[PDB]
Amino acid sequence: DKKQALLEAATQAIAQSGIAASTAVIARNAGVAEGTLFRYFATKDELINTLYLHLKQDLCQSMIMELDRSITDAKMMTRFIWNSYISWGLNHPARHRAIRQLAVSEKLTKETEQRADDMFPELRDLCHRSVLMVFMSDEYRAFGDGLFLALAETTMDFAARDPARAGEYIALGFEAMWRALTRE
Template sequence: MARPKSEDKRLALLEAAKVAVAELGLGAATSLIAKKAGVAEGTLFRYFATKDELLNALYLHLKLSLGKTMMENYRPGSSVKERARAVWSGYIDWGLISPAASKAMRQLAVSDKITEETLAQAAQLYPELHELAEACVTSEFFSCGQSAFADAIFFSLAETTMEFASREPNEAGNYKTAGFEVMWRAMTKG
């Protein structure tokens, strides 16, 4: 009889995958992930049938964590720009608190490993964020369905903002503001 799966082991595997992907990219070996989680490699495959399944689960796990942080100061009745500013600030704060999670998310978000099903599940976690993204990306440069390109630009701007904010914590607020204004102008008509 198969032993029941433990949520603690599943979370340990996701956390280990986060660190491994942040350190080594999507090519991180499952044996290393299992070792970081303190389990045998066979145990990893009891929880996730394939490495791609693990990466998709990690993507959803990180999206859930990120979404919670981004929604903390989200005010549905405020302007699109103010909602976008709240989401941007939440994203930067999340990245500063969890640099490994941020780095892993950036790699997963622009990879071809994340399935359409997983993307649909992620969009359902916080539908208001998905709607906000649709409302924000109004630049003619992104009007032809280039969401992966827009995501990559967003992540690059956010990464630069996080890098400077982490180097100069006393200026973090100024970097968040400047980074947001650059992102806003790039993604929108104004």
């Protein structure tokens, strides 16, 4: 209720100003007292981690609905996932913009990354597994996520500005992403 309202105004504020967004600004735009914000998130760090999970759950639920679990080929399954990402970001630009900033923030906790991997099993292995970014050492997975998000943002930009060619930008960006971030 007030929580959904607070997460929504945090989304918009971080989309616009980054992890720096002020809590009072966020509380104001949710129409709650800043102290009430603190009852929901005592710290900027907690807010970042909860918002990330909230956004990531939203995204993954959208993927679950678009997904044809019969698909066996990893490239084709990866294309469908890319297409659902791109379309989620085009429908919800601030959600994409916020999650992009959260995903690279260094404030995400290992618990949070555990709750990320955990609570969508459907996505673990109705997709066999991986191929994407398997080739990178652990220390660079944040970087490989940053590259994926850079390519997806650019794809969305072009597709929003030139909708008559949206599908073409989507397929070219996918290929770029696939070539960049997978291996033999």
